Design a protein around this ligand. Structure first.
Ligand SMILES: *[C@@H]1O[C@H](CO[C@@H]2O[C@@H](C)[C@@H](O)[C@@H](O)[C@@H]2O)[C@@H](O)[C@H](O[C@@H]2O[C@H](CO)[C@@H](O)[C@H](O)[C@H]2NC(C)=O)[C@H]1NC(C)=O
Ligand SMILES: *[C@@H]1O[C@H](CO[C@@H]2O[C@@H](C)[C@@H](O)[C@@H](O)[C@@H]2O)[C@@H](O[C@@H]2O[C@H](CO)[C@@H](O)[C@H](O)[C@H]2NC(C)=O)[C@H](O)[C@H]1NC(C)=O
Ligand SMILES: *[C@@H]1O[C@H](CO)[C@@H](O)[C@H](O)[C@H]1NC(C)=O
Ligand SMILES: *[C@@H]1O[C@H](CO)[C@@H](O)[C@H](O)[C@H]1NC(C)=O
Ligand SMILES: *[C@@H]1O[C@H](CO)[C@@H](O)[C@H](O)[C@H]1NC(C)=O
Lengths: 106, 209
């Protein structure tokens, strides 16, 4: 787990530590969540950002499946979890887990 | 929500006033409180505009007094970054990050061209008895350039060239060349500032009065 410290009104980029090629997207499922609450899902090429994260979050797929949070507020502070699932023969097996805690300070 | 750019590459003349733009959707009115715009260049912070509040303390020292976000354009769905008196240091990859009912970003590459366009010349009489004159050509540019002197009939003449760095910007060069020749009135001379790969030549015509 990475403990990142950022300042209020800044942008935080939290990395998944995993790069997926555009061809591999069709058979990969990406799950970013904060404090066990869903943030966004890249489901076999289909991105879905959750309503509390639509307005300020960017999903940089080409950059280590990172998420950018513009205009940090103390609310944004919390633990973030990124999950990767690659489909292989039967169904989707877990490939990667990324944990990163955001500390938004004055 | 999608951020768009008219040009993904800007090639700008050194000393110019450049405005790079990022467009984002706006419907009827602009809710200033819901708007976030950031402009950065690689590792340097340029603009931080969150919910209608711009912090100047966040802006990088190299951009102070020269960079500004045109807030009049925001109404039109245009985040326009204006940089006045563009330096060689401004060449690089810019990126705008915008949030207004969704978020997105776009990258702009800026290339700064510093030609030896503004050639300063001086013709002085050294000795009128022997009609000796001293001709000088001086220009600033990047990268280094050699100076070539030619007669009216295009034959090369030997001069003395001094190359130092510009005081205005450390990367920029200040090239000055001097030709001493016994010459008469109304004769034409040429000083050429040759820069290589890509080969580019800037010549000034000097007429002895
Ligand atoms: C480039 O822009 C220079 C700065 O302009 C001013 O400050 C900016 C940050 C921005 O707010 C501008 O809207 C504002 O005008 C400007 O000084 C420069 O020169 C202008 O052009 C003439 C001289 O070249 C002169 O007549 C103007 O008075 C002068 N502007 C000012 C304010 O002095 C501009 N140069 C070019 C090449 O466009
Ligand atoms: C997420 O943002 C939406 C976007 O609404 C607009 O956002 C800008 C483009 C700007 O023009 C605003 O004035 C708009 O409101 C928000 O949705 C609106 O919310 C207001 C109340 O806050 C409501 O009256 C509108 O009907 C909403 N419209 C729609 C279709 O959503 C929303 O509140 C934001 N949500 C979060 C979680 O921040
Ligand atoms: C991941 O790392 C860089 C870009 O982030 C790139 O050179 C590389 O090819 C990427 N890997 C994949 C699987 O695309
Ligand atoms: C350029 O060179 C000339 C000659 O040495 C010098 O007098 C002048 O001050 C220099 N200008 C700059 C901006 O470096
Ligand atoms: C040019 O001028 C000098 C005097 O300054 C004079 O001796 C002669 O006419 C010229 N010199 C040469 C070497 O041609």
């Amino acid at each position: 787990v990475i403990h990142v410290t950022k300042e209020v009104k800044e942008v935080a980029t939290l990395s998944c530590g995993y790069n997926v090629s555009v061809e591999e997207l069709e058979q990969t499922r990406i799950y970013w969540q904060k404090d066990k609450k869903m943030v966004l899902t890249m489901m076999s090429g289909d991105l879905n950002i959750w309503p509390e994260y639509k307005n300020r979050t960017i999903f940089d797929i080409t950059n280590n499946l990172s998420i950018m949070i513009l205009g940090l507020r103390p609310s944004d502070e919390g633990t973030y979890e990124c999950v990767v699932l690659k489909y292989e023969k039967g169904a989707f097996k877990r490939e990667h887990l990324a944990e990163v805690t955001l500390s938004v300070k004055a | 929500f999608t951020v768009t750019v008219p040009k993904d590459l800007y090639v700008v003349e050194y000393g110019s006033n450049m405005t790079i733009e990022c467009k984002f959707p706006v419907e009827k009115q602009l809710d200033l409180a819901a708007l976030i715009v950031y402009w950065e260049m690689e590792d340097k912070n340029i603009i931080q505009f969150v919910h209608g509040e711009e912090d100047l303390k966040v802006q990088h020292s190299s951009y102070r007094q020269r960079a500004r976000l045109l807030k009049d354009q925001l109404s039109l769905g245009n985040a326009a970054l204006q940089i006045t008196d563009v330096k060689l240091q401004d060449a690089g990859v810019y990126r705008c990050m915008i949030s207004y009912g969704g978020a997105d970003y776009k990258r702009i590459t800026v290339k700064v061209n510093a030609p030896y366009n503004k050639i300063n010349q001086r013709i002085l009489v050294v000795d009128p008895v022997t009609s000796e004159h001293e001709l000088t050509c001086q220009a600033e540019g990047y990268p280094k350039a050699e100076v070539i002197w030619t007669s009216s009939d295009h034959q090369v003449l030997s001069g003395k060239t001094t190359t130092t760095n510009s005081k205005r910007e450390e990367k920029l060069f200040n090239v000055t060349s001097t030709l001493r020749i016994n010459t008469t009135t109304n004769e034409i001379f040429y000083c050429t500032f040759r820069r290589l790969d890509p080969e580019e030549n800037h010549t000034a015509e000097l007429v002895i009065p």
